[PDB]
Design a protein around this ligand. Structure first.
Ligand SMILES: Nc1nc2c(ncn2[C@@H]2O[C@H](COP(=O)(O)OP(=O)(O)O)[C@@H](O)[C@H]2O)c(=O)[nH]1
Ligand SMILES: [Mg+2]
Length: 159
């Protein structure tokens, strides 16, 4: 209730890549196969209490963002080819303090994977964004994405 810091976080990427599910898995530790612009979660980093305002309005503005989660779907090449456009919109129309994690979502759908782990890692290195493969569905690397984002926002905040 009594936080030291508040970070504005945006989830961006093409529609159907799992932006909304990623948010719902992190904030309500839920996912379902079956109105909300943002959700709030408070996290503990070192002794600090950090309020996260996590926005999910990409599929419907950037200047204030501490942090971006740039999502593509590993089962959809179009979502991954689009990452460059998304990255361009970030580095242009954002606070030059903003951190970014590249996220290949739905790593649970191994049979329909069209994007390799290493293509993802390689695009990460090209764009200068750390990278995680995730599943909102199986709860894989959702926690680690947000906490890594908080950590690097803190590092930059300290500089
Ligand atoms: N298999 C799998 N499906 C997912 C995952 N995340 C989301 N989905 C599904 O992919 C579709 C798009 O989800 P949604 O979160 O609405 O995508 P958004 O349009 O980017 O918000 C829905 O059918 C979800 O149930 C995941 O990690 N694994
Ligand atoms: Mg959505």
């Amino acid at each position: 209730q009594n936080f030291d810091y508040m970070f504005k976080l945006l989830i961006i990427g093409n529609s159907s890549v799992g932006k909304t599910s990623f948010l719902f898995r992190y904030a309500d530790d839920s996912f379902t196969s079956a109105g909300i612009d943002f959700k709030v979660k408070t996290v503990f980093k070192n002794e600090k209490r950090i309020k996260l305002q996590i926005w999910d309005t990409a599929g419907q503005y950037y200047r204030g963002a501490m942090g971006f989660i740039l999502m593509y779907d590993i089962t959809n090449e179009e979502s991954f080819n689009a990452v460059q456009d998304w990255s361009t919109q970030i580095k242009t129309y954002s606070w030059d303090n903003a951190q970014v994690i590249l996220v290949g979502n739905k790593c649970d759908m191994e049979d329909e994977r069209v994007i390799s782990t290493e293509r993802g890692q390689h695009l990460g290195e090209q764009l200068g964004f750390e990278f995680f493969e995730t599943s909102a569905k199986d709860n894989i690397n959702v926690k680690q994405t947000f906490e890594r984002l908080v950590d690097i926002i803190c590092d930059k905040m300290s500089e």
